[PDB]
Amino acid sequence: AVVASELRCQCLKTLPRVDFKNIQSLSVTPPGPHCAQTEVIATLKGGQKVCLDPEAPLVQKIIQKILNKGKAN
Amino acid sequence: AVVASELRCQCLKTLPRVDFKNIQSLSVTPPGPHCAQTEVIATLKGGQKVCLDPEAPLVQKIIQKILNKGKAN
């Protein structure tokens, strides 16, 4: 009945460091006529994704750590 | 008939800086039993997405520029 998903953002909320070690995927997109702020979408290991910080600026470090965690090639 | 998408990666190839200013979305995911390397997926403005560098390490700068391009709040 009532509405809980309209002119809000990319998600009701977001995490600054979703189950990091679990983060098995990520999705960053700019804001729109409501999100009023960039937002991302990270997936975890096991089957559980969601929306994360705005480009994880404060968590960027831990993020750059997740992005640089592919130094196995 | 022939197969062109098997034990390869997240995409046939990837861009180090897809239509950046157009990049209207992004998706970063780790490699698997074939990609042998982290890969991402960025979308452009107009309706055209694809796979980008591996966390755009060399292009990370221009990327951090796209991630920090939300300083309008």
Side-chain angles (χ1 to χ4, degrees):
Chain A
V2 296
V3 70
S5 338
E6 53 248 81
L7 296 121
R8 281 187 183 270
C9 213
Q10 257 243 294
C11 276
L12 225 58
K13 256 262 185 189
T14 16
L15 300 82
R17 177 203 186 181
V18 276
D19 199 355
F20 226 84
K21 282 255 158 94
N22 232 31
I23 262 55
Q24 209 269 334
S25 107
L26 259 174
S27 234
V28 173
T29 195
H34 56 110
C35 215
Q37 109 174 277
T38 344
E39 210 252 45
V40 202
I41 319 175
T43 296
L44 312 169
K45 254 189 196 119
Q48 247 217 289
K49 168 184 48 167
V50 86
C51 273
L52 104 81
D53 217 20
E55 105 92 338
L58 171 123
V59 180
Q60 199 48 249
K61 250 246 75 66
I62 291 288
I63 253 49
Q64 256 200 310
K65 215 250 293 278
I66 217 55
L67 270 88
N68 219 258
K69 242 283 171 125
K71 232 124 154 208
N73 221 36
Chain B
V2 296
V3 70
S5 338
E6 53 248 81
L7 296 121
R8 281 187 183 270
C9 212
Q10 257 243 294
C11 276
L12 225 58
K13 256 262 185 189
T14 16
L15 300 82
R17 177 203 186 181
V18 276
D19 199 355
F20 226 84
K21 282 255 158 94
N22 232 31
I23 262 55
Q24 209 269 334
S25 107
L26 259 174
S27 234
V28 173
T29 195
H34 56 110
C35 215
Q37 109 174 276
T38 345
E39 210 252 45
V40 202
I41 319 175
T43 296
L44 312 169
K45 254 189 196 119
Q48 247 217 290
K49 168 184 48 167
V50 86
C51 273
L52 104 81
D53 217 20
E55 106 92 338
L58 171 123
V59 180
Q60 199 49 249
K61 250 246 75 66
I62 291 288
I63 253 49
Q64 256 200 310
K65 215 249 293 278
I66 217 55
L67 270 88
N68 219 258
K69 242 283 171 124
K71 232 124 154 208
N73 221 36

